[PDB]
Amino acid sequence: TTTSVTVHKLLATDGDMDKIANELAGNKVGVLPANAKEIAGVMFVWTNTNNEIIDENGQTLGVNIDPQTFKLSGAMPATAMKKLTEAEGAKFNTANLPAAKYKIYEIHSLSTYVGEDGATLTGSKAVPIEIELPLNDVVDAHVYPKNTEAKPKIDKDFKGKANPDTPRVDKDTPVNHQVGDVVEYEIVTKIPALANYATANWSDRMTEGLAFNKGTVKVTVDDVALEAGDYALTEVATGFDLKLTDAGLAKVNDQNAEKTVKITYSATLNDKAIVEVPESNDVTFNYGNNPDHGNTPKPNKPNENGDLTLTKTWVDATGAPIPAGAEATFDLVNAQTGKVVQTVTLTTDKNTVTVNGLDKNTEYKFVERSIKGYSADYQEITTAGEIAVKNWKDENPKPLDPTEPKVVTYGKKFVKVNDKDNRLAGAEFVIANADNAGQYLARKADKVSQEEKQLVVTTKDALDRAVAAYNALTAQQQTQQEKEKVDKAQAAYNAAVIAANNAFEWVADKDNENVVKLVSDAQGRFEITGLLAGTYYLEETKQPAGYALLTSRQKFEVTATSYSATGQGIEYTAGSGKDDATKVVNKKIT
């Protein structure tokens, strides 16, 4: 008794779609919402309740549509019930159709969305229409489907480099940076047209070797800077949390075009950066038509014995305790490398899981594999070896988590020897950028604390006592025990120097308080860390006892693997097996 069904494609906001919803599938909607626009050129096809494309008499055509992909079995049949919308919609003749349930799908690829004023627009495909005929006592039915939810797009990269559509592919390859370098970052987010977000939050956390620079965050929407009342910015040592306020959400929601949100900020590479170990940041976009309590994973180091424990709690959107919703799966990721180490699953009876045999010096993160209707809230790290997640039944889509670029420092190891190839203590050195003129590698004092500075001084004084006492001994009095005393003293000075070295610079004075001095221990060991790859010149400032002061500077090469590669000339430690250091040969006075 429903002779015709007219399908209308609309591009409207949710609110306008809700104005239509309550005002009726049914009768023609007389007055359409204010800004809601009807679109012509939209291809709709009718199917069986079992998704099979149908003829006008209701007879199947051997081709079916996938409920979630809309990809059809084979060729679009010539006899199929397909019609293109007019600014009046697609009026189909349902007269020959039996009383039954039918579905109406949109073939998005076949459609050319043309708006009210003839403009060729771009929109989201419609949610399939499940309708039963006769549509009560309606002779000429009208159906107003809702469109699908377009996914937002993101990317995190270095300033300029970010692209949400086509993010860079070589992100694992870390950029070489020296200690104290400011790393300029970019987060680019594309928010879809006509969005109705209750929450648009960006969350950034980095590894301990990257120090987020507070007050560098600059947010813009379609290259127009945001007012401070559009977003709420929380800033910490490890990163930040930017959450769009109602004012800022107005600038991204119900827009006629795709919105582009740009987030720029920076972080300084520090003393806690490990040589040839990359440092990363980690962004997540927690969007939703519902308030969202989700954020970015927070990295953490395992405990002393190499154990990292995950704790999980579940709450409704209100924050009230609920039983465990599903089997929560997590990825244990090396927060520096980005590679997945292990995979953990919490069964619905357990709310804790522990990982064993992890490097205590590496940062790891548990990245929850999305649960339908639940949002992951990684709580603030309070201790090593322990990670907490609060799971909120926010009923929102999975967050966006782009791939992040990595940064890395290089080093070089050295061993102080004589011509007989015997190991020497107390030789002191400087690093010059050139053999002729050339400044000396120093610490940026402004960046280094008074306490830090002073420990370098006292640990240097303590080391010279250990070196003097060792030179005081005879060749046979210099036992492994007497050697170890110089090593303990040296290891403390080298630890102090690295700690004070949180920014480098080049200075004229080879004996300026801030000049980086390297001292050879009882095994002749001495290293430099936090450098850009390149050519340097090691200069001797104090010779070892009984040897001559060297007249020429030893040239050296800092590479991506100069600290760790074998085939260098001499073993840096004892029984390490790696031939991971360069010889510095001292000659006797004549």
Residue numbers in the entry: 33 to 56, 62 to 627
Original authors' sentences:
In contrast, Gram-positive pili are formed from a single chain of covalently linked subunit proteins (pilins), usually comprising an adhesin at the distal tip, a major pilin that forms the polymer shaft and a minor pilin that mediates cell wall anchoring at the base. The 665-residue major pilin RrgB is solely responsible for the extended nature of the pilus, forming its polymeric shaft, which typically comprises 100–200 tandem RrgB molecules. In S. pneumoniae the genes required for pilus formation are located in the 12 kb rlrA islet and include three genes encoding proteins with the characteristic LPXTG motif. These correspond to the major pilin RrgB and two ancillary pilin proteins, the tip adhesin RrgA and the cell wall anchor protein RrgC.
RrgB was crystallized in space group P212121 and the structure was then solved at 2.8 Å resolution by molecular replacement, using the D2–D4 fragment as a search model. This was the same as previously observed for domains D2–D4, and is consistent with the formation of isopeptide bonds between Lys193-Asn318, Lys349-Asn428 and Lys453-Asn623, in domains D2, D3 and D4 respectively. We further show that absence of an internal isopeptide bond in the D1 domain arises because the β-strand carrying the Asn residue is displaced away from the position required for bond formation.
